[model samples]
Target chain A: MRHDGRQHDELRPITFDLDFISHPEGSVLITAGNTKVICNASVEDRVPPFLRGGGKGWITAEYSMLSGRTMEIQRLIGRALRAVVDLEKLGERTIWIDCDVIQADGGTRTASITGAFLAMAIAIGKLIKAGTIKTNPITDFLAAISVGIDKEQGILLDLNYEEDSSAEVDMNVIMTGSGRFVELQGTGEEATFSREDLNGLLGLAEKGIQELIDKQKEVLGDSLPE
Target chain B: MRHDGRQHDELRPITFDLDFISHPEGSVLITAGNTKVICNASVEDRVPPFLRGGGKGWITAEYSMLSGRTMEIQRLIGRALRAVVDLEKLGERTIWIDCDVIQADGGTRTASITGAFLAMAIAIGKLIKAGTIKTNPITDFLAAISVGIDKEQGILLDLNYEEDSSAEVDMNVIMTGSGRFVELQGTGEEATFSREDLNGLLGLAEKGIQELIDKQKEVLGDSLPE
Candidate 1:
């Protein structure tokens, strides 16, 4: 399934555009192959009920799909997933992150998380500049990627659709920028992959995640005041 | 580029379940390859503006994609295309078709039109049986398909993402059951294709559409109330 004769550990072209939208406090558009996501951050003056007395803030996210965003014609899902927002971690005020899909090539959720961190950083920058908050609410940077064991090959990193479909084992790993893991989902469709295959995929993911984080830091340079 | 090692014109295993959704007058869940689409039809008593006072009925369609419908992540577009609805044919009544993409593996638009016609036919059957309409509103059997000339091959049918991206010439043709054209669109990316190539692709599309019409008829059969 490797089209360009690249090794399984190799990454496709990953690019990001900062401040992609002006209306939102912060926005970043990212693309891995043709998969494009526009992540925007909006800040609210009032904090959540739990944080109102603590004088703190909050960070949350919502994901939506527009019609015909991919090669297939897609309508929005009528049922919503329970939002995995940590209100207590941010203190009181509301920081909303919206991840929107514009195209589907591959690696959209990964792009969303990676781009979201940058958008959140940019939004946090605005708050610091405006003296709205004394400290940044973010505790860690988060990102995710797809990994799999090819039908015959041992293991691969950030498997694209072509590789994904034929995978003996498929896993989507969500990790923080600090090389720590948040979520690890592994499944087998026709045949079950081995434990060694799983570990190999995880090791490759760590290596890939580090590179992606470095790219993120490069994009979100140290221009802001301390 | 064939994932399943099928020929260029080979269609993946397709299955459809009519009346899958409870709310709609008629509905179908259509699956092609890994892609799944839900086509639902709702009939109303009012017709389009052009058909008003003409004592005829009308049919119109809208197609959409769902988020997380593919291996990759996809976001929504800002707005839907200008609905290409036939208003002049139907008198004062309206028919609605909503196509929702559950999983995207290409061939979505074609699948939408193909499955939607079946759903619409079933809805019309219900209307006729209920004495709401005297005859079918559909002017003729309709379906759509994608065809193109590949870089290394001749005209092919229902290209997946890889072929679609690498295709030299591409077109999406919508036609009636009698081999009459309804809509024809063709575009060449890097290399221009010959008129003969165009005809070759159109020929394949005609065959594809005819098969789809046959499938529609099979689905309707004695279930339709004349």
Candidate 2:
């Protein structure tokens, strides 16, 4: 059994609150176990210089933490969010997803991604309602989860800080709601894993991500874009 | 006449206060006209992986505006400081210069570069006093100032927000105390300038930077690095 008393494939308790902040177009406060991330989406009419007159839009993300592991995490979040967004359908504008970590136990990046997707959806809903955008640009639902293999425990889903530190192999998976993988980042620190280990990790990740997608659906409800 | 009622080549009131923050190894509060920036420098024994065995040090900068244009400003400040630093003399370590804009009217980037240099010097002084480093890594004094050409006023130094917005051409100059130019970034917004205008702007910038460098000397006194 794990220290937290969770099953090998079970995720930590997850909750999502929409419209968490009044300033941004869309905002969400998401809590996954002990980790808390606030995601806000701001819309700008201007795209980057490269896409200025291209008629296509862009989705860029900025991640801020009070402490370590931020730059690469920001890049990862941006890429994952863009994976499910059809920029050509978004028109000539930009969506800035700002993710700020309130508290971090582990899997903060994954939590940010899950929360950011909801925030983006809410923002797009508002834009469509306001007649700013004729149609929704979100192509599909997206979520992310972390899975790792512990020395004592087998492949565990949604590892917290303590579990992460001692894990032999770790992976972060981002997937769409339709069961397609968007990104898979895996690492074995001072150790190596076999193909079987990789398969087991992915399996756990898929389960956790599907649960997250369901939670997003429950929170979004009528606001979810087609 | 200019809005601020200053001569064409005159600077706004400038001041510097050291050890403004308690946490960082070195800190300073710098004010120019209505603009204010808090610069803090933290020392770490570790350098980037590439410099591990190089027997040298590095100075990297992070700039934040609460809030405005920042990315390019951070790059500019880092490059300006690095120009006057003899990294090989300081040994293998890293000095992180953090510039936080408190109140921004105009020229926040230039002020940050000027103030960050002071904070860095103070941090290096502490390291030297602690016998961590045998010699100062600073090769020469550094300062920066902004100058611009208004449609009516040919060239004005140390522009405030109102003047900056109306200026046809603007330039920022960074220089060493010995009067060598480190960098010059000039922009013409919907307008162009001639060789005469360029010379006029550089002259004003040189004057302003020299005055700022003198103030740095006055503040550091005996502690000014050779």
Candidate 3:
């Protein structure tokens, strides 16, 4: 049902290497098929101007590939991460998620979001273990998946670069572990979708994300919220 | 006013051209000595999320040179512009100021701030003239200047590339037309300034900025906020 011998609803094989580096409080090298992203997080003792006196924490993101959607993709990943975190419980520090893509695929941004989630979780766990903060501000597990409609292949899940390039419509969905949505961004200048198409795409997204989360839990281990 | 055959309180020969190109609401190619930047702005009807339903406007900036300090410089320019703008009067819209450096000798960031001010002024006028908004949101004239201390030269104003590269201490000052300061950034790893040196550097900055604003008013003409 898709290129690269993937079924319409199948995700490319994903793997995670936790604590990939020692410099950052948390880090990971996450790969979704041929796409690879290194997501690392640094915890700082401050918040941005607006959050300075709010007593709530903040999660901001920076993303970079070889290039075009670098800043735009970062904004999306940051917005997605900020949605599920209970910032108030996280306190007044800042979580800086830096995602650098080592390889390209259709879903770099989605892959970045999924990778950054684990990086952030490990950072939070470190803070808790060190007694820097006692509270767990993360309310749920988060991940993102890509869905698209290709003329010949119909609807496909977790597109690789070639599948994405030929697709008529592309969508990125960010969801929490408990089946709640964080973002649904569907865009296509040359094509549009019917409500039924949206339903099927979202259905595909949910299954893909669930499997991704299950894989996340395998790596997350102690970092998974109690 | 030293290394480049200028005085302690002189700016490089400054000049500007208004209505630089069509398509944007406002545009300018502003030059300060060897530094040249094309500052253009596009007016959009929607405000950013933080300002939504607030009935206030926003001004954001993007700056790029051949390289580094790109994001950092833009943030400064945007902050400088927003300080003098009366957001409530402008209504809900976003003004994007894009400063692209055509040629860079030095003081590029400061030059960008100075140029973006006029580009913003022209945009505000366009909106008022088009009756898109009734009130002028500009509260004061704005400009920026660079003042640095060199080992060979005392308190130099508008350091060119070579002088900037060797300067002991570097500072950038942003001020409104009314003799009020918006921001002052002074940095040097190897040297620090005395209170008197601070006053003298600021004295040079004030004089330089006054001349730049005069140039701004010259091209501004009817856009000069009556």
TM-scores of the candidates in the order shown: 0.45, 0.51, 0.51
- Which stretches of candidate 3 lie above 4 Å from their native place? B1-226
Which residue runs of candidate 1 sit more than 4 Å off their true CA positions?
A47-56, A66-91, A223-226, B1-226
The best-first sequence of candidates by lDDT reads 2, 3, 1
Model 1 chain A is weakest, by summed lDDT over 10 consecutive residues, at A74-83
Checking candidate 2 for backbone clashes, the offending pairs are none
Model 2: per-residue lDDT, tens digit, B1-226? 7777778878888989888989998899999989999999999999897789998788888988761235656666776777777788778888899999989999999999999999999888888888888787888888999998888877899999888999877778777787766666565553445545666777888899999999998997766557
Clashing residue pair totals per candidate (backbone < 3 A)? 25, 0, 2
Worst 10 residues of 3 chain B by lDDT: B187-196
lDDT of each: 0.64, 0.83, 0.82
Instruction: State the lDDT of candidate 2 residue by residue for A104-135, as single tens digits.
Output: 99999999999999999999888888888778
TM-score of chain B of 1: 0.82
lDDT string, candidate 1, A4-86, tens digits: 46687887788879889899988999888767889898878676565578754556576655423432211111001011223
Poorly placed runs, candidate 2 (over 4 Å):
A67-69, B1-226
